[PDB]
Amino acid sequence: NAMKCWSSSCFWKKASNGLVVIPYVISSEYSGGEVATIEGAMRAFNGKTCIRFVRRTNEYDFISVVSKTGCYSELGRKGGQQELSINRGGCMYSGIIQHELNHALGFQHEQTRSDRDSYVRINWENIIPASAYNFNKHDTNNLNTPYDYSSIMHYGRDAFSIAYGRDSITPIPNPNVPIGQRNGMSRWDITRINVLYNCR
């Protein structure tokens, strides 16, 4: 589910000591408690990856965390100031923040993987038309990892559903497999970070 870019000007820089140090600033709009929630979510990367989110000093490439419309991030390192939105009303949860930070690392939604049609059916007629593009298949760098229903990057079955009970995504051949967890990073989520950023 990683974006395909050969240059890695596209990705965060790895230091000679192996750490991928990603500078950030958090909008003054957030209270101290909200800052702590964001930084808490960032710590989830420390135990099992070489990713380190650190407060910016004066680095050129950095993440600016802002409370805008919904929860979103740019994909990968964009160069200079790049925004990541954690709306104060709907996004201040560890798993959601981790999901967004994974976008910033270069990871896309699980259901858009190039191999997705072997694991899910997209029920187009059930999807809010303006939001259907979120379900488009992409030419992803899958990093020799398999499709993971339990990925923090997988949409829930009712994501952008027009009406209750008519799901946007149905897992196949077993429709009962859970999708859409936002508790924490899956084994494959962690493995993918480590493969992409060559963490040792």
Residues annotated in a binding site for Zn(2+): 99, 103, 109
3-state SS string for 99-124: HHHHHHHCECCHHHCCCHHHCEEECH
Is 83 among the catalytic positions? Answer: no
Cis peptide bond upstream of 173, omega within 30:
yes
Binding residues: 99, 103, 109
Secondary structure E strands in the chain: 20-26, 51-55, 62-66, 71-73, 81-86, 120-122, 169-171
Give, rounded to a whole angstrom, the gap between the first and last alpha carbons of the chain.
21
The label of the residue with tokens 């990892």 reads 145
Instruction: Tally Cβ neighbours within 10 Å of residue 108.
Output: 18
Query: Please, which residues have CB within 8 angstroms of residue 72's CB and are 6 or more apart in sequence?
Result: 84, 85, 100, 103
Backbone angles phi, psi at 96, to 5 degrees: -65, -45
Q: Which of 34, 83, 100, 125 is catalytic?
A: 100
Active site residues: 100
